[PDB]
Design an enzyme around this catalytic site. Structure first.
Site, PDB file in Angstrom:
ATOM      1  N   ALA A 106      83.305  37.837  -9.102  1.00 57.44           N
ATOM      2  CA  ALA A 106      81.943  37.544  -8.680  1.00 57.44           C
ATOM      3  C   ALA A 106      81.651  36.077  -8.959  1.00 57.44           C
ATOM      4  O   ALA A 106      81.580  35.685 -10.134  1.00 57.44           O
ATOM      5  CB  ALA A 106      80.949  38.435  -9.407  1.00 57.44           C
ATOM      6  N   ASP A 149      75.313  53.270 -17.076  1.00 57.02           N
ATOM      7  CA  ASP A 149      75.244  52.034 -17.850  1.00 57.02           C
ATOM      8  C   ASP A 149      74.687  50.908 -16.982  1.00 57.02           C
ATOM      9  O   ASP A 149      75.286  49.840 -16.842  1.00 57.02           O
ATOM     10  CB  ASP A 149      76.612  51.671 -18.427  1.00 57.02           C
ATOM     11  CG  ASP A 149      76.522  50.624 -19.523  1.00 57.02           C
ATOM     12  OD1 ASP A 149      75.391  50.284 -19.931  1.00 57.02           O
ATOM     13  OD2 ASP A 149      77.581  50.138 -19.975  1.00 57.02           O
TER      14      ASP A 149
END
Ligand SMILES: Nc1ncnc2c1ncn2[C@@H]1O[C@H](COP(=O)(O)OP(=O)(O)NP(=O)(O)O)[C@@H](O)[C@H]1O
Ligand SMILES: [Cl-]
Ligand SMILES: [Cl-]
Ligand SMILES: [Mg+2]
EC number: 2.7.11.1
Length: 282
Positions: A106, A149
Site C-alpha cells: 500500500a 479487528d
C-alpha cells in the site's frame, strides 16, 4: 506444522508451477512497520522488479504465545480473497527460523497516520472510507468471514488513496458456528465480547461505527483512562457526540453502535444510508 492451504509457488509478475518462493527472490528495503511478532519490510521481486510488502514472523515468538493456528487462519483466508478494497496476499514461504508473508504494498501508508496528521477527517473523506470499507466487509461476509479487528492501524491506502483492509490476524471463517473468542483491540471491542456472549459477523458492524466516530472526532467514542473504565463504557454504550457532528452522521454511528447485535444494520443499509449517499465519493 507450517503447511497452509495457501499459495507458495513463484509468481511471474510480468505475464498473466514448480519453483517455490525463497528469500533469495526479493530485494529488501526499509521496514514499513513493526508487527506483533516481526517487522514488515518493503520488498522487490528481483526478476520483475515488482514492489510488494514482505511481512516476516519469527517462528520462536509465535510458539511462545501459541498463535500458530491464527496465523493459519490469517494466511489461508486472506490469500483466497480477491477484492479492490482488500490487501492481496500473493503467497507465503518459510525457512528454518521465519515465516514470510508476501503482501500487496500500500503506497500511501495507513489510515492511522492520515488521522494523526489531520487530527480528524471531514465528512466526505469519512463517508468514502466507510463505503470502501463496507464494500470490502460485505465481500468478506459473503464468504462467511469476520475480520474482528477493524481499526485505523489495519486500514491501508492504495495508489489512488482508496481504502484496503489489512491484518487478518484475528479473522475467522464462521459459516454457521458462531464464535466465542475475546479478540481485537480495546477501544474497538464490541459489547458481546466483553460480556462473554457469543458473537457473529455483527462485530465488524460495531467496529465500523466506532471507526466512523473516530474518523469524525479524532478519538474513539469509548476512550477511557484504563482497561477497567473502557470495559464499562463499551458495555453501557456510553458515548456522546461533539456539537460539530451532523445529524446524518449522528444517525449512522448510533445505528451501528447498538448494544443488541441484531439491531445493528446490514452493510447494504450502511451503503444506502442518506448520510453516506450524500457525502460518499464512491
Ligand atoms: N502492505 C503494507 N504497506 C505498508 N505498510 C504496511 C503494510 N503491511 C504492513 N504495514 C505496516 O505494518 C503495520 C502493521 O504491521 P503488522 O505486522 O500487521 O502489525 P500487527 O502485529 O498485525 N498489529 P498492528 O501493528 O496494530 O496492525 C502497519 O501499521 C503499517 O505501518
Ligand atoms: Cl474531504
Ligand atoms: Cl474522561
Ligand atoms: Mg497481525
Amino acid at each position: 506444522s507450517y503447511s497452509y492451504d495457501a499459495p507458495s509457488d513463484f509468481i511471474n509478475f510480468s505475464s498473466k508451477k514448480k519453483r517455490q518462493w525463497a528469500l533469495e527472490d526479493f530485494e529488501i528495503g526499509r521496514p514499513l512497520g513493526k508487527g506483533k511478532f516481526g517487522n514488515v519490510y518493503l520488498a522487490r521481486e528481483k526478476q520483475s522488479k515488482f514492489i510488494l510488502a514482505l511481512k516476516v514472523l519469527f517462528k520462536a515468538q509465535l510458539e511462545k504465545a501459541g498463535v500458530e493456528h491464527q496465523l493459519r487462519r490469517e494466511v489461508e483466508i486472506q490469500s483466497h480473497l480477491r477484492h479492490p478494497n482488500i490487501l492481496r496476499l500473493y503467497g507465503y514461504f518459510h525457512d528454518a527460523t521465519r515465516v514470510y508473508l508476501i503482501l500487496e504494498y500500500a503506497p500511501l501508508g495507513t489510515v492511522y497516520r492520515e488521522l494523526q496528521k489531520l487530527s480528524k477527517f471531514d465528512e466526505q473523506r469519512t463517508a468514502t472510507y466507510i463505503t470502501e470499507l463496507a464494500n470490502a466487509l460485505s465481500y468478506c461476509h459473503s464468504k462467511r468471514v469476520i475480520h474482528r479487528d477493524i481499526k485505523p492501524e489495519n486500514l491501508l491506502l492504495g495508489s489512488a488513496g482508496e481504502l484496503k483492509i489489512a491484518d487478518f490476524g484475528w479473522s475467522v471463517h464462521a459459516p454457521s458456528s458462531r464464535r466465542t473468542t475475546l479478540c481485537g483491540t480495546l477501544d474497538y471491542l464490541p459489547p458481546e465480547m466483553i460480556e462473554g456472549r457469543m458473537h457473529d459477523e455483527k462485530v465488524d458492524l460495531w467496529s465500523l461505527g466506532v471507526l466512523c466516530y473516530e474518523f469524525l472526532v479524532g478519538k474513539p467514542p469509548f476512550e477511557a483512562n484504563t482497561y477497567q473504565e473502557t470495559y464499562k463504557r463499551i458495555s453501557r454504550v456510553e458515548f456522546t457526540f461533539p456539537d460539530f457532528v451532523t445529524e446524518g452522521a449522528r444517525d449512522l454511528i448510533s445505528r451501528l453502535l447498538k448494544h443488541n447485535p441484531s439491531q445493528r444494520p446490514m452493510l447494504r443499509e450502511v451503503l444506502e444510508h442518506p448520510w453516506i449517499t450524500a457525502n460518499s465519493s464512491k
